[PDB]
Amino acid sequence: STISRALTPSPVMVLENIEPEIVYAGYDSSKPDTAENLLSTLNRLAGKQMIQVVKWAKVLPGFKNLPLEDQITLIQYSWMSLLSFALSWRSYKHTNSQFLYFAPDLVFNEEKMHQSAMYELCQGMHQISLQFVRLQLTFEEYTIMKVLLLLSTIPKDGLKSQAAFEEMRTNYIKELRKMVTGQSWQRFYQLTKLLDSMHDLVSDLLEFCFYTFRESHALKVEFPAMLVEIISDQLPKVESGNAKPLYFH
Ligand SMILES: CC(=O)S[C@@H]1CC2=CC(=O)CC[C@]2(C)[C@H]2CC[C@@]3(C)[C@@H](CC[C@@]34CCC(=O)O4)[C@H]12
DSSP states (O other), rough: OOHHHHSOOHHHHHHHHOOOOOOOOOOOSOOOOOOHHHHHHHHHHHHHHHHHEEEEEEETTTTSOHHHHHHHHHHHHHHHHHHHHHHHHHHHHHHHHHHHETTTTTOHHHHHHTTTOOOHHHHHHHHHHHHHHTTOOOHHOOOHHHHHHTSSETTOOOTTTHHHHHHHHHHHHHHHHHHHHHHHHHHHHHHHHHHHHHHHHHEEEEEEEHHHHHHHHHOOOOOOOOHHHHHHHHHHHTTTTOEEOOOOO
C-alpha cells in the first residue's frame, strides 16, 4: 500500500495523461470565407471537440464520484468555457498568441476574425491568449484551470450531489494553489481573476451561439447533432435563470 500510494499519479499527472489530442476542423479551404461558411465550420469543429470533452470527462478524477445527471449538467453548462479556454491555450502554445489556433487546419488571423462576423468575440479570446503570455501560463496551471471551468457553473438550487461537487471543486482549487508554489499568492489570485473573467466572455459567446442557433435557418449556419443536443437542452435552462456562475471574487 505504501508503494501503491507513492506511485499513484498526482491529479495533475492524470490531467496531463487524459488531455485530448488536438482535433482537426476539416476546414474546406476551397469554399470562400463567408461568415456562414466559417461559423458552420466552427460549429462542426465544436462537435468534434465535444466528442473529446466527453471522453476526457469519463476519466477525469473526482468527476465520476458525481451522479450522471450532475456530470451531464456541468458539461452542458461549461462546454463553451472549456472549448474557448482550450482555444486560448492552443493559440498561446502553438502561435505564441499571434493567432487564434482553432485547429491545425484552421488558424485565424485578423482577416478571418472579421470574416467570421464575431470579430469582438474573437478579440476577447485572443486577449485571454495574450494574458497567457503575460503570465507565462504553464500546462499544469492550464489543465487545472480547465477543470475549474468545468466546475464553474451549477443549477441555481444546486447539484444532485452538492457535497461531492464541493469536495471535488475544493480539491482542484487546492491543486491550483499547490501548483503556483509573496509571489505565490499574487499568481494564484491572477489565475482566479482570469477564471472569473471567463464568465463574462462566455456569456457573450453563448449569447451569440444561442442567437445563431435559434436563427440558424435564416442565417444558414449549420450545427452538427452534437451541438443541437447540447444547445437544445442548455438554451432553455440558461434562459429560465437555472444557471448559477461560481466566482472566486
Ligand atoms: C472566439 C471563440 O471563443 S469561438 C467559440 C469557442 C470555440 C473554440 C473552438 O476551438 C471550437 C469552436 C468553438 C466552440 C466556437 C464554435 C462556434 C461558436 C459556438 C463559438 C462562439 C459562437 C459560435 C460561432 C457560431 C455559433 O453558432 O456560435 C465558439
